[PDB]
Amino acid sequence: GNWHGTSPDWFFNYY
Amino acid sequence: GVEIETISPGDGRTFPKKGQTCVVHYTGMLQNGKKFDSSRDRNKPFKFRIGKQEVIKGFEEGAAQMSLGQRAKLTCTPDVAYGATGHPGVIPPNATLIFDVELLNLE
Amino acid sequence: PIEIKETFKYINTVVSCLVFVLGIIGNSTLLYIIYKNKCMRNGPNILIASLALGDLLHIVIAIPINVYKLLAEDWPFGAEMCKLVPFIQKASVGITVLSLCALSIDRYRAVASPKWTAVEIVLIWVVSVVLAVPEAIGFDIITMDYKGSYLRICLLHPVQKTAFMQFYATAKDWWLFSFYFCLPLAITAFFYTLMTCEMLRKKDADEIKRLGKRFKKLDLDNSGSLSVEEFMSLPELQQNPLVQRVIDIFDTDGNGEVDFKEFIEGVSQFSVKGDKEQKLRFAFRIYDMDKDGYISNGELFQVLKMMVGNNLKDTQLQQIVDKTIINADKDGDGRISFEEFCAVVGGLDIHKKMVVDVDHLKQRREVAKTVFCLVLVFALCWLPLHLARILKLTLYNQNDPNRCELLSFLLVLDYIGINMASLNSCANPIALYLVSKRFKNAFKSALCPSHRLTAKEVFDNDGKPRVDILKAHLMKEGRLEETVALRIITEGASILRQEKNLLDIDAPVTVCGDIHGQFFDLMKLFEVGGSPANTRYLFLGDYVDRGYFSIECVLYLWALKILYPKTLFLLRGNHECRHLTEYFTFKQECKIKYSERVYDACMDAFDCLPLAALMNQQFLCVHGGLSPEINTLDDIRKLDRFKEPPAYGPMCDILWSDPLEDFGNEKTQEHFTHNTVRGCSYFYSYPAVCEFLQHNNLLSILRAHEAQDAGYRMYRKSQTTGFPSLITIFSAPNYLDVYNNKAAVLKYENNVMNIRQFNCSPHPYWLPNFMDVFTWSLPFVGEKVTEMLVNVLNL
Numbered sequence: 001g002n003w004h005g006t007s008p009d010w011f012f013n014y015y
Numbered sequence: 016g017v018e019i020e021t022i023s024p025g026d027g028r029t030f031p032k033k034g035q036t037c038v039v040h041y042t043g044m045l046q047n048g049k050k051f052d053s054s055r056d057r058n059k060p061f062k063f064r065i066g067k068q069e070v071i072k073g074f075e076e077g078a079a080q081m082s083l084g085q086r087a088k089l090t091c092t093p094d095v096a097y098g099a100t101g102h103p104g105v106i107p108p109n110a111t112l113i114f115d116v117e118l119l120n121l122e
Numbered sequence: 123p124i125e126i127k128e129t130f131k132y133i134n135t136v137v138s139c140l141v142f143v144l145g146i147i148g149n150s151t152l153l154y155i156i157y158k159n160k161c162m163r164n165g166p167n168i169l170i171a172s173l174a175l176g177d178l179l180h181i182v183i184a185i186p187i188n189v190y191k192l193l194a195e196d197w198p199f200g201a202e203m204c205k206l207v208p209f210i211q212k213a214s215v216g217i218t219v220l221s222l223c224a225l226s227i228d229r230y231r232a233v234a235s236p237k238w239t240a241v242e243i244v245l246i247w248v249v250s251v252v253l254a255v256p257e258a259i260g261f262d263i264i265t266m267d268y269k270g271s272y273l274r275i276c277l278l279h280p281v282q283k284t285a286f287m288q289f290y291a292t293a294k295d296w297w298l299f300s301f302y303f304c305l306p307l308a309i310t311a312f313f314y315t316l317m318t319c320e321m322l323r324k325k326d327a328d329e330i331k332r333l334g335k336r337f338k339k340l341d342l343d344n345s346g347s348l349s350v351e352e353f354m355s356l357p358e359l360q361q362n363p364l365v366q367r368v369i370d371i372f373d374t375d376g377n378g379e380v381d382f383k384e385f386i387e388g389v390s391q392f393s394v395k396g397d398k399e400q401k402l403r404f405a406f407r408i409y410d411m412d413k414d415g416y417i418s419n420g421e422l423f424q425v426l427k428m429m430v431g432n433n434l435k436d437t438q439l440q441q442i443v444d445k446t447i448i449n450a451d452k453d454g455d456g457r458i459s460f461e462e463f464c465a466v467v468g469g470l471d472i473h474k475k476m477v478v479d480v481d482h483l484k485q486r487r488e489v490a491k492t493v494f495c496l497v498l499v500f501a502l503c504w505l506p507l508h509l510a511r512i513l514k515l516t517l518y519n520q521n522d523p524n525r526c527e528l529l530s531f532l533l534v535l536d537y538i539g540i541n542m543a544s545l546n547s548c549a550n551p552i553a554l555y556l557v558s559k560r561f562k563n564a565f566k567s568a569l570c571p572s573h574r575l576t577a578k579e580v581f582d583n584d585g586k587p588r589v590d591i592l593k594a595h596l597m598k599e600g601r602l603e604e605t606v607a608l609r610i611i612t613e614g615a616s617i618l619r620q621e622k623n624l625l626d627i628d629a630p631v632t633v634c635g636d637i638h639g640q641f642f643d644l645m646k647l648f649e650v651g652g653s654p655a656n657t658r659y660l661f662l663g664d665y666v667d668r669g670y671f672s673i674e675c676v677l678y679l680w681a682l683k684i685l686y687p688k689t690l691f692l693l694r695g696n697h698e699c700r701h702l703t704e705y706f707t708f709k710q711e712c713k714i715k716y717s718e719r720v721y722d723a724c725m726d727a728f729d730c731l732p733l734a735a736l737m738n739q740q741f742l743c744v745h746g747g748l749s750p751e752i753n754t755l756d757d758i759r760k761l762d763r764f765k766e767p768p769a770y771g772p773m774c775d776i777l778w779s780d781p782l783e784d785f786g787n788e789k790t791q792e793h794f795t796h797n798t799v800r801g802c803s804y805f806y807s808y809p810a811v812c813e814f815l816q817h818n819n820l821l822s823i824l825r826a827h828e829a830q831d832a833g834y835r836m837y838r839k840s841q842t843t844g845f846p847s848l849i850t851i852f853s854a855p856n857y858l859d860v861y862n863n864k865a866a867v868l869k870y871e872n873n874v875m876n877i878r879q880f881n882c883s884p885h886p887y888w889l890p891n892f893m894d895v896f897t898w899s900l901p902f903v904g905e906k907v908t909e910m911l912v913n914v915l916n917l
């Protein structure tokens with residue numbers, strides 16, 4: 001998504 | 016280029032005119048003699064009218080100079096036949112046609 | 123925060139499963155439609171197929187892996203998946219955006235002023251992959267902390283080695299916003315605006331005014347509508363027997379008369395700028411009498427009855443209509459759709475014949491609907507995510523104490539944006555099914571005696587085919603499965619390969635002449651001569667060609683060879699070679715009745731037939747006659763029969779030689795003369811026949827390969843022994859259906875020779891060159907409708 005976390009996702013990481 | 020070489024003469028007095036219907040049996044072949052169509056196999060003759068542009072020009076011209084009951088062979092070059100376009104499924108393109116034409120009846 | 127995550131985990135996993143299932147099913151069905159239905163390939167629909175790929179590679183690989191993450195509460199995979207899955211999503215998004223842009227540009231070209239399509243597909247995929255490469259080579263795995271519990275995370279490394287990757291990480295968001303969301307919408311809006319302006323200023327009055335003048339002139343009663351009588355008012359149309367069908371097709375609303383709008387719409391079907399699909403749809407609707415969208419048996423029969431007239435019988439026309447329906451029904455519903463119709467008559471190029479001078483549009487509804495639907499779906503699916511991103515970029519501030527509700531809004535919006543982006547890769551089949559008529563019909567067709575005998579139906583438990591079932595089926599115009607026919611022909615060739623060059627046959631024996639594919643006449647022959655169950659048969663050759671049912675004769679004769687290899691004897695004819703079979707109608711027979719592999723198997727079986735027989739130690743049976751190179755039976759016995767019959771040698775002489783015209787009364791002593799009629803082999807004389815008979819101590823010779831009015835002919839009686847030296851047997855009654863001759867069969871039993879005669883039998887009719895009725899009829903339809911439209915409009 002569009003956050004900082006432990007995931008790969010479209011724009012930024014996900015929680 | 017239409018040529019009529021006689022196979023068997025007819026009555027020699029009655030010739031097709033504009034307006035009426037010729038009922039005939041025909042058998043066509045390519046230059047190799049392979050049979051591509053023949054109305055005799057159907058056990059029913061084919062009818063066509065003169066002056067309505069229903070058949071190819073060569074066949075109509077050959078029928079014009081061929082008399083009632085006459086049987087002849089017509090040599091039709093592609094300019095008086097299906098030409099370079101041909102007929103899908105029957106006639107290959109730029110083919111010279113040979114027709115065994117027998118005029119049965121005039122109506 | 124925590125509650126939202128705990129509640130949305132279940133939602134995310136359900137979304138992942140739903141996208142998995144729907145995407146796989148829909149995209150697989152869409153690709154199946156593209157690659158089985160032959161009409162779909164004509165347009166830009168294959169770009170749609172690429173979109174399906176652009177979804178499928180994403181759905182089966184990236185979705186399940188993420189599912190594990192949704193139940194892992196951490197990041198369990200290594201660098202490989204961390205680098206692979208986001209590469210897949212970026213590649214899929216690039217494929218979708220480039221496909222939409224290229225397709226919109228392509229049809230802007232299409233409606234305004236192919237190898238290029240394949241090159242464009244390749245370019246789209248290459249550009250998508252190369253643009254997604256930096257993203258894949260960007261991520262990494264790092265474990266920093268979680269305030270006590272170290273954990274690994276897949277993300278952009280905070281520091282990048284190269285300056286290019288530092289620039290990439292700095293402004294990745296706007297690169298993803300511009301190329302993947304701004305460029306598609308901008309390009310599609312620009313090209314659609316140009317198309318709107320194109321139909322704006324390209325609109326004129328000249329053609330409309332001229333067509334209105336023609337409409338007013340034709341409208342005798344000035345009622346604003348055209349009835350049957352006003353169309354018949356032109357004398358030139360009184361000789362066209364396709365008038366009423368075209369008048370009905372011009373009438374779209376079914377009120378019985380054509381108004382100006384319907385006049386324009388009907389005329390527009392024949393513009394120089396119209397597509398081939400419009401012409402083919404007009405051709406389909408010509409036969410589609412009741413406009414149900416399907417061609418059935420009855421409607422086609424009536425249409426061709428009106429066209430042909432009384433030239434053909436009812437029974438044969440009905441039979442060939444049933445044949446066309448059977449061959450052209452690719453789904454077994456008993457009726458022909460437009461899809462199957464254009465799969466059949468696609469190559470006739472009759473669409474180019476229906477040309478008139480006019481320019482009007484009735485199209486641009488359907489496909490414009492589809493393309494705008496696809497672009498709108500793409501825009502709406504990545505809209506919530508972009509809105510969430512811009513809201514976080516603008517209003518989010520971690521320093522603000524009033525921040526918890528901002529998290530509660532942004533996280534839910536991000537969840538919605540992720541879920542919708544996931545659903546987009548599984549929504550294109552649904553969108554196409556809802557917007558497009560062609561796609562909906564194709565999906566409906568896919569998801570939702572013509573019987574073919576199988577191996578269990580032909581072969582029993584012992585491997586011996588049941589002759590009665592094959593007999594009845596092939597009598598009833600039935601067909602056979604490819605595997606069964608190939609099996610029969612191949613193992614029949616295997617059986618025949620073991621026989622010697624010269625067969626030793628003892629009395630009683632029945633000998634038959636040329637059959638030439640006359641399956642029903644072959645039936646009459648077997649009936650007259652007695653069933654093969656108790657009668658030995660010697661066929662002299664020519665089982666194919668000159669007929670329309672040769673494959674039936676082949677199947678049944680080698681079937682009896684399967685059942686009765688030792689009581690049934692077959693000899694080669696000259697027509698079982700490459701040259702004669704490709705020259706005559708047998709090749710097209712195999713191509714239409716079966717596949718070319720069946721032709722190859724049939725030819726291989728033909729290659730294995732024996733050549734000659736020795737009957738009752740007194741008689742020699744061949745197909746043609748003697749050779750100048752053959753003096754004793756040993757020459758025949760040493761022949762290599764497993765080859766193409768060469769243009770010269772004892773092979774060609776045995777398969778092609780004929781007696782002289784004046785056999786038995788020839789003027790000279792020349793034994794052999796050149797054969798001009800056949801173009802090969804030689805004419806042989808009565809002195810030569812007597813020489814061969816006396817030298818080899820044979821009494822008479824049986825042959826075929828010459829037409830006989832009575833079906834048989836005994837040549838001159840031999841001086842030394844008093845028996846007819848050469849007997850020709852013909853068993854093809856009504857040869858080529860023009861000879862009207864009889865057929866004869868030769869029975870030898872108890873030193874008694876009896877010739878039995880039989881005549882022709884009815885057989886179903888086939889159009890020349892084994893074509894269907896549509897290929898027969900389409901050019902005539904096109905020419906007459908074009909002549910009508912030229913006589914009406916152009917003047």
Ligand SMILES: C=CC[C@@H]1/C=C(\C)C[C@H](C)C[C@H](OC)[C@H]2O[C@@](O)(C(=O)C(=O)N3CCCC[C@H]3C(=O)O[C@H](/C(C)=C/[C@@H]3CC[C@@H](O)[C@H](OC)C3)[C@H](C)[C@@H](O)CC1=O)[C@H](C)C[C@@H]2OC
Nearest residue numbers: 043052069070071074097102105429430898899901902905
């Ligand atoms: C099914 C309904 C259609 C309708 C079919 C019938 C009434 C049955 C009728 C016995 C046709 C035969 O069907 C078994 C078969 O006869 C042939 O085998 C043939 O021996 C042939 O050459 N003939 C037939 C005898 C007259 C001369 C010539 C012909 O002028 O034929 C004409 C012909 C094809 C003209 C085309 C028309 C299209 C133009 O574009 C083209 O212009 C270049 C010229 C035929 C009579 C047409 O007027 C009428 C039809 O077509 C053709 C090789 C193919 C043709 O099947 C189509």
Ligand SMILES: [Ca+2]
Nearest residue numbers: 345347348349
């Ligand atoms: Ca009117």
Ligand SMILES: [Ca+2]
Nearest residue numbers: 375377379381
């Ligand atoms: Ca109307």
Ligand SMILES: [Ca+2]
Nearest residue numbers: 414416417418
């Ligand atoms: Ca219908």
Ligand SMILES: [Ca+2]
Nearest residue numbers: 455457458459
């Ligand atoms: Ca169907």
Ligand SMILES: [Fe+3]
Nearest residue numbers: 664696697827
């Ligand atoms: Fe032969």
